[PDB]
Chain length 147, copies 2
């Protein structure tokens, strides 16, 4: 369809179980029985780790006072939306009632990485490094800019 799962080519990764990927992309308004909500919950903590790990390695200054606000931006909806563009998740998400929002794209973006993690055999290094190959550039840049 519109979907086709050609996201995996944008993503650089091919899913084993294709139901995973779909559950990450599916809003509850499309499906109340199989949507992204629990993937999202895992994906928030996962991605948070990926970003805090990078941040502590590439930040000009290693003080919590400099890190936390920067951390705050790098895990925000606006930033996640900036990173999702590259994947253009809004083409593959399935939702019902006309309320796609930017917070949903962030939800899905977080769910997506949780989906890659699990479909990878819960391998965090691989998944970490896959996140880095796609977004490290953009993160270092934001880190460059500060704020």
């Amino acid at each position: 369809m519109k979907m086709l799962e050609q996201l995996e080519k944008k993503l650089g990764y091919t899913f084993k179980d294709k139901s995973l990927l779909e559950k990450a992309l599916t809003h509850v308004s499309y499906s109340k029985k199989e949507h992204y909500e629990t993937l999202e919950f895992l994906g928030d903590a996962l991605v948070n780790f990926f970003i805090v790990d990078l941040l502590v390695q590439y930040s000009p200054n290693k003080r919590e006072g400099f890190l936390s606000p920067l951390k705050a931006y790098l895990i925000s909806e606006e930033f996640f939306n900036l990173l999702a563009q590259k994947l253009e998740l809004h083409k593959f998400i399935r939702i019902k009632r006309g309320k796609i929002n930017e917070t949903i794209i962030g939800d899905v973006f977080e769910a997506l990485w949780a989906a890659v993690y699990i479909d990878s055999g819960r391998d965090a290094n691989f998944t970490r490094e896959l996140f880095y190959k796609l977004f490290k550039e953009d993160i270092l840049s934001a880190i460059k800019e500060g704020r």
Copy 2:
């Protein structure tokens, strides 16, 4: 006095960089130059991930509603100290002015895990396994422990 790092024996891990271990148990009070501050910033995200991945895996109700208040119990001070006590970390911490603070042995438990992770060569899988080895039965129990 009461050190000699039997903690590596408590933990089941030997640091290739003993100084790294040391910095994780040292509050600024004992050294404004080499304390647990940045490791803490890393292990919070680190430890947040390990516990959420467990939550999301073994929790009965895979719902944001159930998860998130169950979650904030697991990453709660009370639990963290609970976990720490199986390492008697309280006694290996190097703070000045006898002001331990229950919400300081929480920062050291986190720093300690960032320290293992980094020393291990940034190996998330390994570190998560060591963490589970040490505390999954607790969490899996604390989770089914009502609500």
